[PDB]
């Protein structure tokens, strides 16, 4: 595999990969990791 | 074509299957919710983007900044199965579902392969006091006390100042860390980063 990889590069047609969200004052990080990766993969896998 | 999938919707509507709302959850249960119920769109706070935008406002996490300081946790808002006024179509018909969901082995080669093949994953690591001071570079834990797990997004890898890293997105806004992203040591299961990684594949039509 390459020695470095950055999804933001490979798929610069998928804006969400570069987006950083805010969990505020709530331990929601479990949801955040999940929906952010899920948003990415919807565009990566998009026919 | 692209969608911001709603954290609001998964936070508030998964229920006990995902754990306890704003007092913690189970990311593997979060990917199985999406596969079973789906997840609607929704943007960032006050964005008015999508079905269900996020309703908890931003704050400064451990940085100085203009926003209010962050409070402990708060109240998990509630599951409203309806979209905001102004958004169309209906909540049910804004659902997106997953085909499937899985664990990725605690192997940086396996984890480089998943991302490489399929795009970013979710992992989780133990946070220690020294983390919170993360401004730049490759993160390696020397001091501090343990503060629990932090579930993140891992979106690549590389080598910096001779250190092999993982490229991770945090959810503490853009003004913490490296513009809200960070690098943590790769290949040693550092702080558990390689042990708790889950992903899944979208369902297509």
Curated annotation (Swiss-Prot), chain A:
Disulfide-bonded cysteines: 14-43
Catalytic center residues: 29
Protein's name according to its UniProt entry: Cathepsin B light chain
Gene that this polypeptide is encoded by: CTSB
From Swiss-Prot, chain B:
Modified sites of kind N6-acetyllysine: 92
Carbohydrate-modified residues: 64
Disulfide bonds: 13-79, 14-18, 51-83, 59-70
Active-site positions on this chain: 150, 170
Protein name: Cathepsin B heavy chain
Record organism: Homo sapiens
Phylogenetic lineage: Eukaryota, Metazoa, Chordata, Craniata, Vertebrata
Gene encoding the protein: CTSB
Shown chain mapped onto the complete sequence: 129 to 333 of 339
